């Protein structure tokens, strides 16, 4: 749902992310891959090694995908509509795998924003990403 209180947090916690947005998007990934190995099976064509420009590039891609979502929160389903098909249909990503990346997306934010990642804002994002992951596995329900 996202109370106007959450979307403000999200919107305030993300602005602080700024241009680092794409870097954090690549850091989250690396985290997911090292932490939850079973996710590497989706990225065979990727060189999941530490400096991997591919992982760097998709990190930017994932970053922008969320930005699109923040700046269009009061209507995520229409915005990420596309991505849903792409992940739900073509790629067939196990829904679980979204809960993991969502975890590593916060583990990355928290290790970068020590002043904003308060318990309240921590929950806002968890909610945000939960909705983002709902939308993407929507073409499943």
């Amino acid at each position: 749902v996202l109370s106007p209180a959450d979307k403000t947090n999200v919107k305030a916690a993300w602005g602080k992310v700024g241009a680092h947005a794409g870097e954090y998007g690549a850091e989250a990934l690396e985290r997911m891959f090292l932490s939850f190995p079973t996710t590497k099976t989706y990225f065979p064509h990727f060189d999941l090694s530490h400096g991997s420009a591919q992982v760097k590039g998709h990190g930017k891609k994932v970053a922008d995908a969320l930005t699109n979502a923040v700046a269009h929160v009061d209507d995520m389903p229409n915005a990420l509509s596309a991505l849903s098909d792409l992940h739900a249909h073509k790629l067939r990503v196990d829904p679980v795998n979204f809960k993991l990346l969502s975890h590593c997306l916060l583990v990355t934010l928290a290790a970068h924003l020590p002043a904003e990642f308060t318990p309240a804002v921590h929950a806002s994002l968890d909610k945000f990403l939960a909705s983002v992951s709902t939308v993407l596995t929507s073409k499943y329900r």
Partner: protein
């Protein structure tokens, strides 16, 4: 809990720094705040209405402290986690009746707290290192569920 010796040093060196006092409650609290349904097991702790009330609550810092004792404990008994947590298991299981899914969440917030306090030192390899531990602990407690 296998844990390559290099993942051991990662987990080892980091832990010894942890403010074993504050960190405990920092986790449990955020659990109650970010996963509201958890709160159904600590009504007895007092006001848990706002986040500010949960993070200021003395019952919470006192319990999270213990909860971290269980970690530090299991963290120095990986070799056998089930036995270490045999008692706690039964308690959380056939007594409190807490869904094992919640032992993964708590472990997951703990990993966020640890990321919050060590920011950049908490590298991706050190995260996946703790991620093994959290599942390891998270499973030993769900044992009695068989």
């Amino acid at each position: 809990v296998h844990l390559t010796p290099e993942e051991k040093s990662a987990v080892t060196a980091l832990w010894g720094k942890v403010n074993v006092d504050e960190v405990g409650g920092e986790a449990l609290g955020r659990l109650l705040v970010v996963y509201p349904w958890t709160q159904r097991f600590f009504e007895s702790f007092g006001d848990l209405s706002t986040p500010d009330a949960v993070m200021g609550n003395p019952k919470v810092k006192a319990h999270g402290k213990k909860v971290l004792g269980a970690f530090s404990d299991g963290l120095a008994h990986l070799d056998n986690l089930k036995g270490t947590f045999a008692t706690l298991s039964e308690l959380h299981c056939d007594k409190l009746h807490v869904d094992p899914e919640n032992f993964r969440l708590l472990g997951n917030v703990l990993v966020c707290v640890l990321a919050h306090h060590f920011g950049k030192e908490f590298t991706p390899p050190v995260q996946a290192a703790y991620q093994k531990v959290v599942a390891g602990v998270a499973n030993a407690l769900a044992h009695k569920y068989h």
